[PDB]
Amino acid sequence: HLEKSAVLQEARVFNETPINPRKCAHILTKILYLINQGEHLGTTEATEAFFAMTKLFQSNDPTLRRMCYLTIKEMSCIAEDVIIVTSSLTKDMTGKEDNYRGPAVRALCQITDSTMLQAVERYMKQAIVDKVPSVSSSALVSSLHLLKCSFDVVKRWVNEAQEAASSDNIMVQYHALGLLYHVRKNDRLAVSKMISKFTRHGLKSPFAYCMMIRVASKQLEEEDGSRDSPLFDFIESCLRNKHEMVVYEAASAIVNLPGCSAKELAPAVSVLQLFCSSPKAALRYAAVRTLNKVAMKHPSAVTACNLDLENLVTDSNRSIATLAITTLLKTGSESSIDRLMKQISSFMSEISDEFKVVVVQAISALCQKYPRKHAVLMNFLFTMLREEGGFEYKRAIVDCIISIIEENSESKETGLSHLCEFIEDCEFTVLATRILHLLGQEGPKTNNPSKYIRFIYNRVVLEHEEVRAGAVSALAKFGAQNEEMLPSILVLLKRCVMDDDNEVRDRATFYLNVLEQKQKALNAGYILNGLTVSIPGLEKALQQYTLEPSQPEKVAATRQEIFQEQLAAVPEFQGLGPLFKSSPEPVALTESETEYVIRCTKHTFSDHLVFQFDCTNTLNDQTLENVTVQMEPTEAYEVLSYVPARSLPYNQPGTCYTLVALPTEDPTAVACTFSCVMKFTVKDCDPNTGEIDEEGYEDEYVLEDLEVTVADHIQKVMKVNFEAAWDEVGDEFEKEETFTLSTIKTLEEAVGNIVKFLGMHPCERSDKVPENKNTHTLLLAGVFRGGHDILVRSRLLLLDTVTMQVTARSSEELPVDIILASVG
Amino acid sequence: LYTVKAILILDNDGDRLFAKYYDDTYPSVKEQKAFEKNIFNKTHRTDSEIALLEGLTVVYKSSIDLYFYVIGSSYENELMLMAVLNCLFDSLSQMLRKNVEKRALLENMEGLFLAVDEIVDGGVILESDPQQVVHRVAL
Amino acid sequence: EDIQSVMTEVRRSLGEIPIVESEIKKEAGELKPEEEITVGPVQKLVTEMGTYATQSALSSSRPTKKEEDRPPLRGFLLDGDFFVAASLATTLTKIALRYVALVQEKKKQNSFVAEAMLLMATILHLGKS
């Protein structure tokens, strides 16, 4: 239509004296036209045009004002000294009428940056509360843009934003709730308060419902303090308003992840909610679906089926038919697959071009995804090869072949062989590469390789370089794997085809010379089956889904080992007792992502305990350095050393340790409590993940106590015969004490309490005791730190409560004393 | 805050009489036109309120020599999108003082540009009331 | 002696690289064990040659791709090879400085049989009886 240069240029007159609202407005229209028609502005002339226009803001005409808003936003980024236009926009923005109000806030806020943010706020507060949708919605979207430049200004607007939220007017609410969710967010909980306020309400605003559904879709039970249900009384889990999109979004989330469970007037576990909307017009597309559903997509699938299946079969309209395939695909599942496959077979008949490729891929893809047997997948993959013969590709040769060598290989090659009979050189580089690669790699004894070779030999002549090169190298590997083959390799390679073309020659000269001339140490080594060049995943199935309706390694296996590894890096802990075990009951001192996350584990050594404290400073305003967790033992333990966490910045874990020595004569338990306080140096930080200030202050954060149990000292085992082990460990360290467990009225619980506490597995599966028997003998075994066995015998008497005489024997005085004390 | 991906009003080839991009995904002419040609090819010569293109529900209508578009998300349905598309058709008609054809749009290029910006704002649906848009805009 | 410099701009440049792998794999080291140097002698080249084939190594600012061309070819033969580092002996160099089978005339053994345009017409001629 227009020329960008002439129009950008003539705009410069505004900058001088002429303001002429008609002429300038036209010139502006022309700018909008240059963009719209599709053109790109030249920067010098743009920069000039922008400074000129600001003069035009003096004249207040509604059409000129309008031109001015669109033109400055489009020209804003390809212009300089734009800042002048802010004042003019504020002047316009306060002027009453929707033409100015709404369009200005949007143009102003786009140009506005954090410095300028402050200016627009009075006018913004006035514009947001409006139940006149233009002014309010433009102001609400405007605030969203402004969250970037400066967050804090926008946040103050949360009250005006909320005020708009209370409208049932669709725009004012959609914008209000949507924006609010973004704005007020400083934690989940404050947003959740905003949502609960609207939540109990039966809106007539579908957009608000939708934007909110998304916020809601996850279970929120902290909305406005707390509440006893994930409840959403606005359609998400409810079905207060029917309208097929909202109904679909809501129904797929709620069914197997309740936003609330099913109500008689609002299904929300049952499959129903989608289905009542399901017979419909074009509208049906949302309605008919599924996704998730109780307990599977399949009972759901049956409802809707009439609709999806008739459109999919009948309509050879692309627009309908696509909705019908997506809808079939959605009502699908593992079960559904029988049905889904016949339909997809049928579908290509309506739209057959790419759609053909897709159905032959889909039937294979569905068989791989939803199991109807891996074999059937191969058989479908043959049908794909047959029908298209060329829309298979290179990625198919690699994917078919890799997939095939899971089971199919002998068959696949053979099928391929037959498939190769097709068409000599229009079959493509890829099929020849597949029969060639497979015949090379399997080295057929399932069928005679001679047919395969004869088929491939012809294809090579008239097809691309990459296959002819493929054919020589394959032949060489084929030689190395099977001796028999060598005579065919020679007739093929001497030919002008499989060698002596171009690329084919170079590869061949190498491959040939290595087979012919050389040892074939290399050739032998090279064939490991004669496999592909790469093993990807199973690419086809996802591709197909969209297209149709258009080494974790480990050391440790035990808590002691993983901790032992962590400990081992540090010297002191392995140098001063080596680790018998680490706790089977590690206790987290301070909860996750509050102030600190500290998890401590107590590790036992031959004569020591090391406490590993994994410390996180989740303090947004700080970053920590030289952090240690300090300890006060409540019994006689010596605290030898502290190992610091070098730094703990915001949200970054670090580990600190305290090594203490264990008593080895203590008459009371090694079940003991340590009071923990982390001390550290704080340097100020701007929350990101870390950043330290030039100077800072000392600060401390209090932590929970760490409890060490007898369970940490002992590792559980059972014995085949307790009595022998029990005598064998040391009846010379034997001590006996009688306890009453009055809070345990039966033997079975009693055995469980001694077993858990001590960290001893009761022998011979003695946690199950004959219910309410007068006498019982409980056999305990486990190994104590240092590597010495500890056996405990508890002879239980059951009155109405449990009394036990617990006799313990151990290779030391300490386990005996420790167990006896801890139990009572 | 997002519903509408883009709005296009296209001649009966898919070429840009108009498009205004409420996505940031097409700003350059080459690609804005490619998009336009892409959506017009699927959707056209099968009029319904549904089309699925690019994994997005595309809602469209037609006139004498134009096809009118809203592209939006496919987690929705036609009807939500349709409310935008109906506003788009309607508001342009009342605004221009003549029904949407290539002739009405070209007749008043300014009414068309302004009217569409009121309907969609950066992919959020700013307005959907045809009457409101028309008063809001000044020719 | 240029070779690190020439190869390296390409090795870190892009274009289309499937078949590139095969050809570079048998090729890069060859001929004389230490007779180049720009900031990568012939040995860096053998390193490179191996990385490009299917290995991994910092050399020529890394190769463009490593994953080979059509499924049969793979890296391995050549990887084993370069017994004597890029030197005319019984390695890549041997292969490179030798020609696969007979190569003489215009019988189509490293040949193409006259002038390419005249040949299209002769191929067309089926000579059906």
UniProtKB/Swiss-Prot annotation, chain A:
Protein origin, superkingdom: Eukaryota
GO MF annotations, alphabetized: structural molecule activity
Regions crossing the membrane: none
HEAT repeat boundaries on the chain: 44-81, 263-300, 302-335, 336-372
Keywords: Cytoplasm, Cytoplasmic vesicle, ER-Golgi transport, Golgi apparatus, Membrane, Phosphoprotein, Protein transport, Repeat, Transport
Gene3D superfamilies xrefs: Coatomer, gamma subunit, appendage domain, Leucine-rich Repeat Variant, TATA-Binding Protein
GO biological process, any: vesicle-mediated transport
UniProt keyword Repressor, yes or no: no
Spans annotated as Interaction with ZNF289/ARFGAP2: 559-824
InterPro entries recorded: ARM-like, ARM-type_fold, Clathrin/coatomer_adapt-like_N, Clathrin_app_Ig-like_sf, Coatomer/calthrin_app_sub_C, Coatomer_g_Cpla, Coatomer_gsu, Coatomer_gsu_app_Ig-like_dom
Subcellular location: Cytoplasm, Cytosol; Golgi apparatus membrane; Cytoplasmic vesicle, COPI-coated vesicle membrane
Membrane disposition: Peripheral membrane protein
Family: Belongs to the COPG family.
Described purpose of this protein according to its UniProt entry: The coatomer is a cytosolic protein complex that binds to dilysine motifs and reversibly associates with Golgi non-clathrin-coated vesicles, which further mediate biosynthetic protein transport from the ER, via the Golgi up to the trans Golgi network. Coatomer complex is required for budding from Golgi membranes, and is essential for the retrograde Golgi-to-ER transport of dilysine-tagged proteins.
Complex and partners: Oligomeric complex that consists of at least the alpha, beta, beta', gamma, delta, epsilon and zeta subunits. Interacts with ZNF289/ARFGAP2 through its C-terminal appendage domain. Interacts with EGFR upon EGF treatment; interaction is essential for regulation of EGF-dependent nuclear transport of EGFR by retrograde trafficking from the Golgi to the ER. The coatomer interacts with KDEL receptors; the interaction is important for retrograde trafficking of KDEL-bearing proteins from the Golgi to the endoplasmic reticulum. Interacts with COPB1. Interacts with TMED10 (via C-terminus).
Protein name: Coatomer subunit gamma-1
Curated annotation (Swiss-Prot), chain B:
GO biological process: intra-Golgi vesicle-mediated transport; intracellular protein transport; retrograde vesicle-mediated transport, Golgi to endoplasmic reticulum
GO cellular component terms listed in the entry, alphabetical order: COPI vesicle coat; Golgi membrane
Membrane topology of the entry: Peripheral membrane protein
Location of this chain's protein in the cell: Cytoplasm; Golgi apparatus membrane; Cytoplasmic vesicle, COPI-coated vesicle membrane
Family to which this protein belongs: Belongs to the adaptor complexes small subunit family.
Subunit description: Oligomeric complex that consists of at least the alpha, beta, beta', gamma, delta, epsilon and zeta subunits.
Function according to Swiss-Prot or TrEMBL: The coatomer is a cytosolic protein complex that binds to dilysine motifs and reversibly associates with Golgi non-clathrin-coated vesicles, which further mediate biosynthetic protein transport from the ER, via the Golgi up to the trans Golgi network. Coatomer complex is required for budding from Golgi membranes, and is essential for the retrograde Golgi-to-ER transport of dilysine-tagged proteins. The zeta subunit may be involved in regulating the coat assembly and, hence, the rate of biosynthetic protein transport due to its association-dissociation properties with the coatomer complex.
Protein name: Coatomer subunit zeta-1
Residues of the full protein shown: 10 to 148 of 177
Swiss-Prot record, chain C:
PTM annotation, UniProt: Proteolytically cleaved between Ser-59 and Ser-60 by CAPN8.
Source organism, top-level taxon: Eukaryota
Name of the gene this protein is made from: Copb1
Section covered of the full-length record: 470 to 598 of 953
Record localization: Cytoplasm; Golgi apparatus membrane; Cytoplasmic vesicle, COPI-coated vesicle membrane; Cell membrane
Cysteine pairs bridged by disulfides in the record: none
Parts of the chain that traverse the membrane: none
Lineage: Eukaryota, Metazoa, Chordata, Craniata, Vertebrata
Additional remark text: Brefeldin A induces dissociation from the Golgi of the beta-COP and presumably the other coatomer subunits.
Subunit structure: Oligomeric complex that consists of at least the alpha, beta, beta', gamma, delta, epsilon and zeta subunits. Interacts with CAPN8. Interacts with SCYL1 and PRKCE. Interacts with COPG1. Interacts with ARF1 (myristoylated); this interaction is required for binding of COPB1 to Golgi membranes. Interacts (via trunk domain) with ARF1 (via switch I region); the interaction is direct. Interacts with KCNK2 (via N-terminus); this interaction increases the channel-mediated whole cell currents and promotes plasma membrane expression of KCNK2. Interacts with STX17. Interacts with TMEM115.
Protein name, UniProt field: Coatomer subunit beta
PTM sites of type N6-acetyllysine: 25
Tissue-by-tissue expression: Predominantly expressed in the upper one-third of the oxyntic mucosa and in most regions of the pyloric mucosa. Ubiquitously expressed including platelet, liver, heart, spleen, lung and kidney.
Function: The coatomer is a cytosolic protein complex that binds to dilysine motifs and reversibly associates with Golgi non-clathrin-coated vesicles, which further mediate biosynthetic protein transport from the ER, via the Golgi up to the trans Golgi network. Coatomer complex is required for budding from Golgi membranes, and is essential for the retrograde Golgi-to-ER transport of dilysine-tagged proteins.
